[PDB]
A paper describes a structure:
In Bacillus, the Rap protein family modulates complex signaling processes mediated by two-component systems, such as competence, sporulation, or biofilm formation, by inhibiting the RR components involved in these pathways. The second subgroup, comprising RapC, RapF, RapG, RapH, and RapK, blocks the action of the target RR by a direct interaction with their DNA binding domain, and works as an anti-activator. For Rap proteins, regulatory peptides are called Phr and their mature active form is a penta- or hexa-peptide generated from a ∼40 amino-acid precursor by means of a post-transcriptional export-import process. As previously disclosed by the crystal RapF structure in complex with the DNA-binding domain of its RR target ComA, RapF was an all-helical protein consisting of two domains: a small N-terminal 3-helix bundle domain (residues 1–68) and a large C-terminal TPR domain (residues 98–370), both connected by a linker region (69–97).
In order to determine the molecular basis of RapF inhibition by Phr peptides, the X-ray structures of RapF alone and in complex with its inhibitory pentapeptide PhrF (QRGMI) were determined. The crystal asymmetric unit showed two molecules in the free RapF structure and one RapF molecule bound to one PhrF peptide in the structure of the complex. The structural models for the free and PhrF complex forms were refined to a final resolution of 2.25 and 3.1 Å, respectively. A comparison of the free RapF and the RapF-ComA structure reveals that binding of ComA to RapF only promoted slight local conformational changes in RapF, which were mainly restricted to the RR recognition domain (the 3-helix bundle plus the linker region; 1–97) in order to bind the DNA binding helix of ComA. The core TPR domains remained at the same position (root mean square = 0.66 Å for the superimposition of residues 98–380), which supports that RapF in solution presents an active conformation that is competent to bind ComA. When RapF was free or in complex with ComA, the 3-helix bundle domain was projected apart from the TPR domain, thus exposing the ComA binding surface. The RapF TPR domain folded in a large superhelix to generate a pseudo circular structure that was closed in a wide channel (8,588 Å3, calculated by the CASTp software) by the interaction of the terminal part of TPR7 (and the following C-terminal tail) with the initial part of TPR1. As a channel, the generated ring-like structure was open on both faces. Arg80 was located in a loop of the linker region, participated in the ComA binding and was exposed to the solvent in the RapF free from.
Author numbering:
A (entry chain A), B (entry chain B): -1 to 381
Amino acid sequence: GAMTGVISSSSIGEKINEWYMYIRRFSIPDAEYLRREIKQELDQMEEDQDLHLYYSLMEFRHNLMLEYLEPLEKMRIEEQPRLSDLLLEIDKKQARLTGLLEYYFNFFRGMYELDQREYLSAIKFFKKAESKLIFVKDRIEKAEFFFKMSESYYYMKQTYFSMDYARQAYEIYKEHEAYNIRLLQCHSLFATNFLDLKQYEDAISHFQKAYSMAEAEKQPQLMGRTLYNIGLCKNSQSQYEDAIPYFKRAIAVFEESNILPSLPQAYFLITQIHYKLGKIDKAHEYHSKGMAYSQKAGDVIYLSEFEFLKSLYLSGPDEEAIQGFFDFLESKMLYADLEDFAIDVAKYYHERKNFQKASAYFLKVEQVRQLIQGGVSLYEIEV
Amino acid sequence: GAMTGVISSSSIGEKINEWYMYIRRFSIPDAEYLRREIKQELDQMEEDQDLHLYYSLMEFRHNLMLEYLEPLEKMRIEEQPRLSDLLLEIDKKQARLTGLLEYYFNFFRGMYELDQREYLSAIKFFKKAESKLIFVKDRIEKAEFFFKMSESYYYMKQTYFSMDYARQAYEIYKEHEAYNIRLLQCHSLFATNFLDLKQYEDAISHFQKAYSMAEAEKQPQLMGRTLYNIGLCKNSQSQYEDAIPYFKRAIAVFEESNILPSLPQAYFLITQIHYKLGKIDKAHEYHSKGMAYSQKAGDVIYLSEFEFLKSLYLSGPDEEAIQGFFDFLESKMLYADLEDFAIDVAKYYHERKNFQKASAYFLKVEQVRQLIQGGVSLYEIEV
Ligand SMILES: OC[C@H]1O[C@@](CO)(O[C@H]2O[C@H](CO)[C@@H](O)[C@H](O)[C@H]2O)[C@@H](O)[C@@H]1O
Ligand SMILES: OC[C@H]1O[C@@](CO)(O[C@H]2O[C@H](CO)[C@@H](O)[C@H](O)[C@H]2O)[C@@H](O)[C@@H]1O
């Protein structure tokens, strides 16, 4: 599907949330342990500054925990206030810090729930985080929220909300300067959602706009992703001849800049396209390179998918290797890839008048669509 | 698809919107006009009183316009205020009322936009409405909002958000006493959403729960819909025999209460099931009754869908009448019906080992899936 992509650490945010839970309970050894463990981790990482802003605040909240406990040392246990009453006091006198921590807590707890594929739960925490945006005074930090809500709702395919949030983030980024990289990213969010709605031309316009902006910013990871995504739009519309140039330009960018993570996917559709077109000559060359990149990075999913291309276009087809591939994708919950591929096989046969085979794979497409793919649980509701 | 609702016109709420436009324009003849005419459309209404409440606050707003304009007939052009100024005076003195008016205004404007298939715009207005909820007094009216949001996002297939709003509505209705009908309707919402997610067991559980409660409230319209929908779930899963008693029970309920407008749908899938089973005698039975109900209710769509059952299972298939039927659904934008039926045709030919023709209708499905069925437009975003 579309190149998005990359950089979760739902791990760390949720660790800071747990640290906060230990802080509110005055679980001192546990709070000290996490205070140390998380620092070490965040130290090997110019990645989110999300996490960094949050860490600082909890650092300060940890120190206030210790300040409020210092008096208790000059006290008989019977004189000392209950810890629940100590906590009520901290929160009273730091209404503002409390609400900003409550913002991040829900935010990162939602991100974690999302990684756990607990969607309704994730939305619940995301809405509670949105309620605490009043505690987020900085406008760019508000826009970051909206931006990551757009990504999140893109992953959940709540297309309309993903675009509404991208438009909220856009409004803010646009009125500052060089938030231009975030702005072009808003463009790819519009584009990727347009694509899911089958609005290919509008997706292409936003991908082109985003490309132009990435070139001006000299952001080659982004230049290549948008190039790739425009070829994808063309490919989905069976406009094979227009797809190829974008796929080639995307490959060149990634390579010239040594972007290894992106290269197995960058090589994949272009390889499929040549098999489809009967240009076996040029297919085998693309198949080998992308095959070689997948080996280097140990891309399990792309190794398996390049092997699929040989099972269909070269090897019979090997219906047996195809079924096991489908079981593999299914077991990995790669349901979109699976449906597309099951169509590819149906279409392969259809075009060769093996209507009985085409048809069995069209029935397989149906069997995948009937699977619970993004299922949900009600929180505390009794039937 | 799943039965639900009753409606609506999305027209009276928009008329009160228009009414308030002239109020803010101080255009008294036009204000006066709609005040009378909306008054007259309301008292002849099976009212959800969104509207009446909205009307009443607007009637007061209309008098505050006639009242603010009193001192004006005592003045000549030069003495009198700018009507821009007069409006800001009225807004600043009536903070609470004005916000409560914005609540309703945005809510009914979003409904109208949804009705115009302007989805992102409908969400933009719905969020404005949600944000004036602070001006909304009472918790049952908050619950009404959430419940209606859940209905709207169900219609927009933003399934997770639809379930999140149903849950928020549920929580309020649950702690209240005489809101059992609302509560069972929340269960139908979880159920219809679970269905879209392929969680059939969860959907049945919640449909069964809402049936149970609808029985207790002696609410036959609800009893029939929930029974039909359980049948629908069995039908979706190809559990055809299991489906029949459910549809029979539903039809018994709709007939007992002369629920004429539900009978065409009620009869539809049970007819199709009998064809599917090769029970042409029973099939011909349900088909004549379902078709007669469609003729009497003036149901244009079912009249045409019963015709298609003839075309497919009796007439050849009559491929040509099937093509004109598909075009008809496509033109009315009935895409879910269209895809299901195209699959029904594929499977019928498949079972008869006409794999070429099966394979051609499997390709129709894929074409229908490629249409822009829910396209969107960005508000004011360049290139
Ligand atoms: O590579 C991980 C990362 O890439 C994305 C696109 O940005 O998905 C691609 O790679 C997957 C294999 O890991 C493919 O299955 C998929 O078809 C392709 O789009 C992201 O979805 C993923 O996080
Ligand atoms: O009666 C219109 C109303 O019924 C619903 C289900 O509650 O849809 C049914 O009727 C449609 C044709 O009018 C069918 O195409 C559809 O398959 C069927 O569920 C509502 O969706 C619709 O607004």
